[PDB]
């Protein structure tokens, strides 16, 4: 409806990055980097866009935010920074 937002304090979705959202994120970054877009890491002799994005993730230099949608229509925004990878 109108502004079905959620306060960041009251969030119960999994703080861990699901394998699906990780693959989507890495794909979108490797796409951005396939085109001549800026890289936010010191590429230590790396050329593959996917390896670049994968190493941009470990240093958490990927400024994207997931919008986890709930069935009622509500949603939770989660920055890549606060998300966990394991």
């Amino acid at each position: 409806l109108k502004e079905k937002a959620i306060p960041k304090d009251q969030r119960a979705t999994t703080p861990y990055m699901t394998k699906y959202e990780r693959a989507r994120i890495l794909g979108t970054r490797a796409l951005q980097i396939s085109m001549n877009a800026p890289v936010f890491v010191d590429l230590e002799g790396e050329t593959d866009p996917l390896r670049i994005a994968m190493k941009e993730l470990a240093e958490k230099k990927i400024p994207l935010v997931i919008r986890r949608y709930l069935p009622d229509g509500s949603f939770e925004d989660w920055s890549v920074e606060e998300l966990i990878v394991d």
Binding site: Y16, R68, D86
Partner: protein
């Protein structure tokens, strides 16, 4: 919170049976640091072992059932594919209706 206590109820039973105070010290011989490492590993493997949202588990289940039936091969009761088709297609006129009485 009740749903959570219910969803883990079985695991915690194994947990307590395995980390019993006399067990940790007589069967295992855990030091303090080894014990805290056991705790960390269990929590980590658990939190990894949770199902990842977005999983299309319906198709996964349907395949997980259909494929082992493709190898379903050849003492009075219908079994195998005939019985399975009796089950899915709700079969009012079953071939072998039986009743087991205790």
């Amino acid at each position: 919170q009740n749903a959570q206590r219910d969803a883990v109820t079985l695991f915690c039973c194994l947990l307590r049976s395995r980390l019993a105070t006399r067990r940790v010290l007589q069967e295992y011989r855990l030091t303090k640091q080894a014990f805290d490492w056991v705790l960390s590993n269990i929590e980590a493997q658990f939190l990894r072992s949770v199902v990842h949202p977005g999983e299309m588990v319906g198709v996964l289940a349907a395949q997980s059932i259909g494929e082992p039936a493709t190898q379903m091969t050849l003492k009075k009761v219908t079994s195998g594919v005939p019985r399975l088709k009796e089950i899915l297609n709700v079969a009012k006129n079953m071939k072998t209706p039986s009743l087991t009485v205790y």
